[PDB]
């Protein structure tokens, strides 16, 4: 019937918790803005499990964020297939985890995890031929990698059609 | 040349400072990994410098011009006397932005990977702008719901600075998509694939093509 907004709550989190939508929640409360102060009482029209997710202050994310939007070129005129696995190694280096240079080695050296969790490496076949691209899974179906566009570091969705197609599996490198 | 590793230093950060690549930096030092202890001493690449002796030049004058002695400049070139002739070749010795600790970026990162679906059956043109309004709600700025309203109700800006709303026309008919420009030419938005929030490059061919300008709400 009624919900009282707790600190950190959002219209998204509340709508999702009670199996409705932000729209319905705004309509039924006559809200015209997404602004939400603690103690605010919202009318409402079995809590679902929470996806594992990195913290904005996590060592893994902070490392990724340092390079976010920055092109990561391994050598003078190095190909993307080298840049992507060199970026992955560089991030993990900031965490004390040594990693092999090449995407291939990274793929073969580590044990396969069927459903990846925050920290695992996800691999793809861009050219179709072989596993030739790698990124760092961040949780919630997104991963960080050096992209085709100038090897700039970006965060994209694993559940995009292109990536679902070029997908090649995940590997574990930490605990 | 020589550099000693400080805590928090990386191959990338070191290569950048001394104007070289991570690849060469590893090869030259026989590194088997990117792992770098703060007690380490990495050999830096040395650049080759030559000088063709012009009229008026002497070994004493060239010594103080490049930062060396006449004796040092003599060994390197295998001379016995300070004699150089005109035309002789002498060897000679020897931008970012993003801040994780930021109100705007703290809020954005809160939604990474989240499928921000505003309604039960809402279009991406609505999802993306609801998301933008959602992030700014945590920064005390009340924005409209729709893309169309965020587009034509705020001052247009030539180039975008972090925070500004970047607009696109995925459809072609009208402006129907919006994101939050973060800096370094990347923007946060609800993606077409599943309304998932991602952070993509503004400089990708497609987005550079369907770009429709930037607006300032702050």
Numbering used by the authors:
A (entry chain A): 17 to 61, 117 to 246
B (entry chain B): 17 to 110, 122 to 245
Sentences from the paper on this structure:
LysM domains, which are frequently present as repetitive entities in both bacterial and plant proteins, are known to interact with carbohydrates containing N-acetylglucosamine (GlcNAc) moieties, such as chitin and peptidoglycan. Here, a structural study of the Thermus thermophilus NlpC/P60 endopeptidase containing two LysM domains is presented. Glycosidases, such as muraminidases and glucosaminidases, hydrolyze glycosidic bonds between carbo­hydrate units, while peptidases, such as amidases, l,d-endopeptidases, d,l-endopeptidases, l,d-carboxypeptidases and d,d-carboxypeptidases, hydrolyze amide bonds of the peptide stem at specific positions. d,l-Endopeptidases belonging to the papain-like peptidase superfamily possess an NlpC/P60 domain which is responsible for their catalytic activity. This domain is commonly associated with PGN-binding domains such as the SH3b domain, choline-binding domain or lysin motif (LysM).
The P60_tth structure was solved by the single-wavelength anomalous dispersion (SAD) method using selenomethionine-derivative protein. The final model contained two molecules in the asymmetric unit (chains A and B). Analysis of the crystal packing with the PISA server indicates that a stable homodimer is formed within the crystal. The catalytic domains dimerize via a surface area of about 980 Å2. This dimerization interface involves 17 residues mainly belonging to strand 8 (S8) and helix 5 (H5) of each monomer. Two salt bridges are established between the side chains of Arg223 and Glu230 from each catalytic domain. The interaction surface between LysM1 and the catalytic domain is 593 Å2. This interface involves residues in the vicinity of H6 from the catalytic domain and residues from H1 and H2 of LysM1. In summary, the SEC experiments indicate that P60_tth is a homodimer in solution and that the catalytic domains mediate the dimerization. Overall, comparisons to known NlpC/P60 structures strongly suggest that P60_tth also functions as a d,l-endopeptidase involved in PGN hydrolysis.
